[PDB]
Design a protein around this ligand. Structure first.
Ligand SMILES: CCCCCCCCCO[C@@H]1O[C@H](CO)[C@@H](O)[C@H](O)[C@H]1O
Ligand SMILES: CCCCCCCCCO[C@@H]1O[C@H](CO)[C@@H](O)[C@H](O)[C@H]1O
Ligand SMILES: CCCCCCCCCO[C@@H]1O[C@H](CO)[C@@H](O)[C@H](O)[C@H]1O
Ligand SMILES: *C(=O)c1cc(N)ccc1[C@@H](*)C(=O)OC
Length: 179
């Protein structure tokens, strides 16, 4: 079954998604979004918690499916702490880039997912002895996912700075780790 980190991320995203349905999207964003006013700059959770918010059923479903699979794999083969760090780094960096180009009103675990895609792949392709890799078939679907993000094929208004920054981060960490 899914490790503790894989699990708590999924439950946290579900809990937050429920709150967004009950209270509305904007209201939850007041609390969890990247700082949108200078008065909010020291509320350090916001640099990360944007990743917990999803704006539709499909948004959350596909993110959690990928997270469940890729995150679960990282945790099992490389440990909980490693998944934690990939998650914090990709969340922080993807938010930063997204914000830079589009402002603070955004959310979604997809920055982390793309990081996990790049990470699991490059790490298997450069350090097979790590005991983790992205199976041939899933490489294909990962690529399609990336293509869909890049060309805005999801039918989402959300921009896609988060997407490329996430992938770049995952690749970079795999590089460093395979050394
Ligand atoms: C504080 C957020 C996660 C709660 C800790 C309990 C689940 C993780 C257990 O790890 C082992
Ligand atoms: C369900 C995850 C929600 C995380 C919110 C963290 C905000 C903590 C504010 O206290 C300070
Ligand atoms: C699993 C298959 C992925 C489902 C993604 C479907 O994308 C569709 O694309 C349209 C524009 O391309 C959007 O208008 C529409 O809302 C959206 O549903
Ligand atoms: C994904 O979670 C996400 C998040 C943000 N902030 C911007 C874009 C995207 C793209 C996406 O949902 O790809 C699936």
């Amino acid at each position: 079954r899914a490790g503790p980190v894989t699990w708590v991320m999924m439950i946290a995203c579900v809990v937050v998604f429920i709150a967004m349905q009950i209270l509305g999207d904007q209201e939850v964003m007041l609390w969890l979004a990247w700082p949108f006013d200078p008065t909010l700059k020291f509320e350090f959770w916001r640099y990360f918690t944007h990743a917990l918010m999803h704006f539709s059923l499909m948004h959350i479903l596909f993110n959690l499916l990928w997270w469940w699979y890729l995150g679960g794999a990282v945790e099992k083969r490389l440990g909980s702490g490693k998944l934690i760090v990939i998650t914090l780094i990709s969340a922080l960096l993807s938010g930063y880039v997204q914000q830079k180009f589009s402002g603070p009103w955004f959310g979604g675990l997809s920055g982390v997912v793309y990081a996990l895609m790049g990470y699991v792949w490059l790490r298997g392709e450069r350090d097979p002895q790590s005991g983790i890799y992205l199976q041939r078939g899933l490489i294909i679907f990962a690529l399609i996912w990336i293509v869909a993000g890049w060309f805005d094929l999801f039918g989402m208004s959300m921009a896609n700075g988060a997407h490329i920054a996430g992938l770049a981060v995952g690749l970079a960490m795999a590089f460093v780790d395979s050394l």
